[PDB]
Every structure is written in structure tokens, then in C-alpha cells.
Structure 1
């Protein structure tokens, strides 16, 4: 059994975003919209339900850990359910949470060379936190092969490079390298059950589709409904293809991609505050439900029993 816990399901900024008064964020505050608040994307994995692996550490991490009981087993005066942390990129929304975990250092952190470089230069988390009882102990994620964290020995992670979208602070935002962004394939080596996790998805080729058909659950990018969604809300100028996000609707959309996977469980995660799928009375939400696609939410439990 693989326990998957959605701690956060919103894109950077959360929902509602602190400075946004779009139809969703204002509709939530005014109470004229059936929607649920969401923290920034983060999931937790376990093979036993006691030892947990954190995938990305959001700025909302303190609230995310409180809301989930197994994170505090109370086995000692100082304790936590987090046994390791895996980083998919060096983005602010996925790494800032590490600052809030300074009291429980050291931590085993799994990231790539490129992420480790960003987190030792532009955003030197590894250098800052080292002053807290050991800090972050880096475990390299090589772009090939697989890795197993000793706390969840039945979990097999097989990373794959996705199209690079390096953070703005990054020394090489203008010079993208493989290793800037990862999608994860987690396998329960007891059952063969596979999870395809890719909150940041901006390009999908035929070799990516190949391994997706070997998965049982697809947990992927759901940031935007339209590529120009930020303009249609009048809160931004950036498009999904600029930010490296494949929108649900349109040609080469996620809904077009996911349509070739009728046998897999399909969940949209990392959802921006402007996305109408957050509105449960929205026709967009209807089309998503109609296609057998779920909209992740804070507190969602995904249990992986077996392979099909």
C-alpha cells in the first residue's frame, strides 16, 4: 500500500492568493462561490503510514503539517513524521518550506545537481540551514536509474527530466539545463503500483507518454484552464506556455493527453487561483468530472493498492 497525501494542491500564491481579487479569489472572500481554500502544492508519501517522504516544501508547510496528524507521532519531545524530502525543482513555492523546518535539522534532502546549485547560490538554503545542527544533507538525484529512501524501503522513485523552467532568481533561468525540473514515478515494489507525479508539466513527448501507460495514477499539472487565463482574469500577462504549464483546454491540452488514458486514475494538482475548476458549480469542473478526471484538494487521500 502506497499512502499519498495531498498537503497542498494550489499553484504558487495558493487559493485565494493574498493580493488577488479575481472572480475566484473575490468570490471566495465574498462567499458567493462554492470553492475550497487551497495551500501551495505539496504531497506526502509513505509505504507504512508512519514514515513519510515530503515531496516539495511549500511556504504553507506549517499549516499543512498541522492539518495532518501522522506528521506528529509524538514519539519524543522532539519528533516529526517527515523522514526525507524530495525536491522536483528550485522554485520558491517548493523550497521555502525548508526554512520552517530548521528546528528539526538535519534532514535528508533529495534533489538534482542543478537544483542543488540553485539552492547553494541564488537561494542558498543548503548554506543557511547548515548553521542549524547539520542542516540539509544532500542526496543526489541522477537523471537516470532509480533511488530508494531507507525510511520507505518499499518505495522506488524513478525520476525523469521534464522541459526546463528554471526559477527567476536562478543564475541559469536564461540557460536551461536538464535537471531543473523532474516528474516522478513512484512504485510500490510489493504490489507494482505506480504513481506518476508531475505537478509541473509544460511539454509531453512520446517517450513521456510511454511510461505514463505503465502508471496506475496520474497526478499532473492543472494550473490553467486556458493558456491565456491570466489575461482573461486581468491579473497577469504571462501565459501557461511561458510558465511551462500545459493548460487543460485546447490542442495539446492535458485533457487531450489524458483522453488516451481511460484506465488510469487521473487527478489534477497544482491549480492556480484563477482556474475555474476550483469553482464546483463551473462548467469547466463539469467537463473535468465528465472525463473521469479529479480535482485535487487539501486533505485528499490517494491510496494505491495494486497495479492493473
Structure 2
């Protein structure tokens, strides 16, 4: 079995977002919206249910670990079910949780050279945390080939660089490089079962599509329903294209893309607080369901048992 646990399913800011009173956030607080609160984007993976690899360490990590019992196996006075961390980018919503793991260093952290550069300069987590019992031990994710983390020896990870959209603090946001952003294929090598995980997806091409057809489950960017959602909700002016996100709806959107993948389990994750698919009663949620696409929620468990071929 490959076990996938969704710790957090929201985009940056979570749901509801602390400073937002958009129709969803305010509707949630007022008790009029049928929706469930979500913490920030993060999943955990395991090949045995005991040793876990954390993919992205969100600012909500304390609440996320608390909610998932295998995160505390209680085998010793100090213990954790996290055996390694993999980072897919250097965004604040995917890295700030490392600060909350300071009491448990050293930790093995896998990330690209690009991300390690951000996390030793602009957001210098590797430098800061080194003062807590050795801190973060960097394992380089190369831009080709695959890697296996010893704690989960049956999971083989193959990174795929995606279009670079480095965070605003990055000494190179204006000068994007391959390795700023990854999607990950993860294979259980006992069964061939494969997960493709890309919480940020701003572009697809034929190479990416072909590689995705090899997957059994696609767990992909669900940030916005429409490219101009933030303007429609009155909560800003950024578009999906500016932020590196393919919206669900419209030409070139992810629902059009996912139409090419009938055999795969398809799950949207990293959903912004503005996205109507969070409202369980919306026509947008009904449309995703009609298309065989699921909307990730906190605490969702995905089990991959086998490969489709």
C-alpha cells in the first residue's frame, strides 16, 4: 500500500483566511455556507503506515500533525512519525512549518539546489535552524533521475521541473530557474502504483501530459475556479496566470486537461479560500463531481493499492 494523507488542502492563507471576508470566508464564519475549514497545502506519504515523508511543511503544521495520530507513535519520550521532509518549492506556505519542527532536529530535508539557495539566503531556514541540534540536513533533489528515502524504501520519487514561479522574497524572483518548482511522481515499487503530485501547476505541455498518463492518481493544483477569481471576489487584482496557477474552468484550464485522463483518480488540492468549489452546494462543486474529479479536504486518506495496467 502507498498511503497518502492530506494534512492541508488549502492554498496560502487557508480557509477561512484570517483577514478575508469574501463570500466563502464570511459565509463560513456566519454559518450559512456548507463548507469545511482547511489548513495550508501539505501531504504525508508512507509505504508502511509507520514511517512518513512529509511533503511541504505548512505554517499550520502543529494542528496538522495533531490531527493525524500516526504522526505521534509515542515510541520514546521524544518521537515523531516524520522521517523526512520533501519540499516542492520555497514558498512561505510550504516551508514555514520547518520552524515549528525546531525541537526535533536534525531533520533530513530533500529539495532542489534552487530551493536550497532560497532557504540559505532570502528565507534562511537552513542557516537559522542549524542552531537547533544540527538543524536541517540537505539532500539534493537533482533535476533528472529519481531518489529513494531510506525510511520508506518502497517509494521511488521522480521529480519533474515545472514552470518557475519563485516566491516574492527570492533573490531570483525576477530571474526564474529550473528547479524553483517541482511536481513529483511517487511510485510504490512493490506494485507499480503511482501518484503524481503538483500542488502548483501553471503550465502543461506534451512531455508533462505523457508522464501524467503513467500515474494512477493525479493530485493537482485546485487554486482558482476562474483566472480572475480574486477580482471577482473583490479581494485583490492578481490573476492565476500571474501567480502560476491554471484555473479549473476555461480553455487550457485544469478540467479541460483532466478530461484527457479518464482512468486516473483525480483530486484537486491547494484550493484558495475564494474558490467556489469549497462551497459544497455550488454549481462549480457539482461540475467537478460530474467530471469525476474530487476536492481534497483535510484528513482525506488516499490509498493506492495497485497500478491500472
Fold shared per TM-score above 0.5 = yes
Q: How big is each residue's C-alpha offset from its partner over 1:18-49, in whole Å with a ceiling of 9 and x where there is no partner?
A: 00000000000000000000000000000000
Whole-Å separation in 2 of the counterparts to 1:102 and 1:8: 20
2:109 is aligned to 109
Q: How big is the shift at 1:201? A: 0.2
Q: Secondary structure at the match of 1:302?
A: strand
Q: How big is the shift at 1:278? A: 0.1
Q: Secondary structure at the match of 2:147?
A: coil
Whole-Å separation in 1 of the counterparts to 2:205 and 2:2: 27
Q: How big is the shift at 1:4? A: 0.1
Whole-Å separation in 2 of the counterparts to 1:254 and 1:166: 21
TM-score, structure 2 normalization: 0.99
Whole-Å separation in 1 of the counterparts to 2:262 and 2:82: 34
Q: How big is each residue's C-alpha offset from its partner over 1:244-300, in whole Å with a ceiling of 9 and x where there is no partner?
A: 000000000000000000000000000000000000000000000000000000000
Whole-Å separation in 2 of the counterparts to 1:189 and 1:288: 31
Whole-Å separation in 1 of the counterparts to 2:107 and 2:299: 24
Whole-Å separation in 2 of the counterparts to 1:112 and 1:196: 18
- Segments of 5+ residues of structure 2 without an aligned counterpart are none
Q: Secondary structure at the match of 1:117?
A: helix
Whole-Å separation in 2 of the counterparts to 1:137 and 1:261: 38
1:258 is aligned to 258
Q: How big is each residue's C-alpha offset from its partner over 1:128-173, in whole Å with a ceiling of 9 and x where there is no partner?
A: 0000001000000000000000000000000000000000000000
Q: How big is each residue's C-alpha offset from its partner over 1:25-83, in whole Å with a ceiling of 9 and x where there is no partner?
A: 00000000000000000000000000000000000000000000000000000000000
For the aligned residues, what is the CA RMSD? 0.4
Whole-Å separation in 1 of the counterparts to 2:188 and 2:181: 23
Whole-Å separation in 2 of the counterparts to 1:213 and 1:160: 14
Whole-Å separation in 1 of the counterparts to 2:164 and 2:172: 10
Q: How big is the shift at 1:118? A: 0.2
Q: How big is each residue's C-alpha offset from its partner over 1:5-26, in whole Å with a ceiling of 9 and x where there is no partner?
A: 0000000000000000000000
Q: How big is the shift at 1:87? A: 0.1
For 1:44-59, list aligned pairs within 5 A.
44-59=44-59
TM-score, structure 1 normalization: 1.00
Q: How big is the shift at 1:219? A: 0.2
Q: How big is each residue's C-alpha offset from its partner over 1:149-206, in whole Å with a ceiling of 9 and x where there is no partner?
A: 0000000000000000000000000000000000000000000000000000000000
The number of residue pairs the alignment matches comes to: 308
Whole-Å separation in 1 of the counterparts to 2:118 and 2:142: 16
Whole-Å separation in 1 of the counterparts to 2:23 and 2:275: 10
